[PDB]
Amino acid sequence: TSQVRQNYHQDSEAAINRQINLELYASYVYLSMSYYFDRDDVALKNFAKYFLHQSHEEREHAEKLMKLQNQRGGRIFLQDIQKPDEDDWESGLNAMEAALHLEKNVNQSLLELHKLAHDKNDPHLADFIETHYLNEQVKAIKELGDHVTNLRKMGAPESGLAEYLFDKHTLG
């Protein structure tokens, strides 16, 4: 056993490793969306910038869990990062909807992680999740919902003008 390990259940350690993979997976999904909007036949560079920024932030989420794993004396076991479920994200509105779905999935995993930590009476892990992950997810989800709402109201994805104007005035 690790000399630092204290009050850290094997189930929590394993769930942290799963969450690490999920954060890396979200990073990769966002990377894919980013460069979809960089295509010459899509050409929405603030959509591309927006999702590249999300990609880098998801990598930060993963690295902070990796630090946590070592902080608590657990051991990191990395798994493959699955490639995303689409190569072509169809439209700005469709991508924002896919991102919203993704962030809710990550949120559900964080909430189960918090439930596990509390069930094992690991208040340090529960507050780590509460402090660094839960409100970030709520804000992320709310922002994505706002974007989806505006794109739909503007007439996307039918209206190429809607996405162009959203790219310029909201994401730019």
Residues in 61-120 that interact with Co ion by CB under 5 A: 61
Q: How far is the CB of 47 from a second copy (least distance, A)?
A: 12
Cα 56–77–51 angle (5° rounding)?
15
**Per-residue x/- track, 34-73, a second copy (CB under 8 A):** -xx-xxxxxx-x------x------x---x--xx-xxxxx
Torsion sign across C-alpha atoms 46, 27, 113, 67: negative
Q: Give yes or no for residue 5 binding Co ion (CB under 5 A).
A: yes
Question: Is 87 one of the binding residues for Ca ion (CB under 5 A)?
Answer: no
Interface characters, 12-41, with a second copy (x: CB under 8 A): ------------x---x--xx--xx-xxxx
Backbone angles phi, psi at 22, to 5 degrees: -65, -40
Round to whole Å and give the CA distance between 44 and 95: 12
Give the C-alpha separation, 29 to 48, whole Å. 12
85 part of the interface to a second copy, by CB under 8 A: no
141 binds a second copy (CB under 8 A): yes
From 98-106, 122-130, 133-141, 148-156, give the range in contact with Ca ion by CB under 5 A.
122-130
Residue 125 CB contacts under 8 Å (≥ 6 apart), including other chains: 8, 12, 68, 72, 113, 117
Quote the least distance from Cβ 153 to a second copy, whole Å. 3
Binding flag, residue 51, Co ion (CB under 5 A)? no
User: Of Ca ion, Co ion, a second copy, none, which one does residue 168 interact with (CB within 5 to 8 Å by kind)?
Assistant: a second copy
Chain breaks in the chain (C to N over 2.5 A) after: none
